[PDB]
Write a protein that binds this ligand. Structure first.
Ligand SMILES: CC(=O)Oc1ccc(/C=C/C(=O)NCCc2ccccc2)cc1OC(C)=O
Ligand SMILES: [Co+2]
Length: 166
């Protein structure tokens, strides 16, 4: 089922999500609803709090060569934790909870994370570029952080201008 997407400046997006402890049918349905919700709004990443669920889980489904998304490559990361991070790069980001606004944010160009899939299986994943950016962006949501929070002095002003624009 489709779930309501929470938009900035809702205080709900500042929540610190909690670890998932029961990987059951209920959790799986929330993940399915999240995927259905992300696609319907044409996003490539979505954190649980963006739909009102203060849980430490998020999904990422980057499009392939053809430019289309295949539910097969969808990553479901629960209880993530950074093992290592390195480098630095700028990436223009967007967010379903801040529709209509896109701005460059500084991110690590490489990260290694540890997490669990929907079946509680432990995984270790190394990522770079786009995938590494999505991971950092989504994980920020779990800690109540939005990418507009990480904007430089100037860009923050541009955000306010464009915000007043809508
Ligand atoms: C008007 C407009 O274009 O609004 C949108 C803005 C962003 C998005 C999607 C953003 C998104 O998936 N971000 C994932 C996290 C990420 C950040 C940077 C690089 C990789 C991954 C969708 C929109 O469409 C609707 C219908 O709300
Ligand atoms: Co986001």
């Amino acid at each position: 089922a489709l779930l309501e997407i929470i938009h900035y400046p809702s205080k709900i997006l500042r929540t610190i999500s909690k670890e998932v402890v029961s990987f059951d049918a209920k959790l799986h349905q929330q993940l399915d609803d999240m995927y259905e919700t992300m696609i319907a709004s044409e996003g490539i990443g979505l954190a649980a709090i963006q739909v009102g669920l203060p849980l430490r889980m998020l999904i990422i489904n980057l499009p392939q060569e053809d430019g289309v998304q295949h539910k097969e490559d969808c990553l479901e990361i629960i209880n993530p934790k950074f093992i290592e991070t390195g480098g630095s790069m700028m990436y223009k980001e967007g967010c379903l909870s801040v529709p209509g606004f896109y701005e460059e944010v500084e991110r690590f160009e490489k990260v290694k994370i540890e997490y669990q899939n929907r079946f509680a299986e432990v995984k270790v994943l190394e990522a770079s570029e786009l995938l590494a950016v999505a991971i950092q962006h989504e994980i920020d949501h779990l800690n109540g952080v939005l990418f507009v929070d990480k904007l430089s002095i100037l860009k923050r002003k541009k955000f306010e201008k464009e915000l007043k624009e809508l």
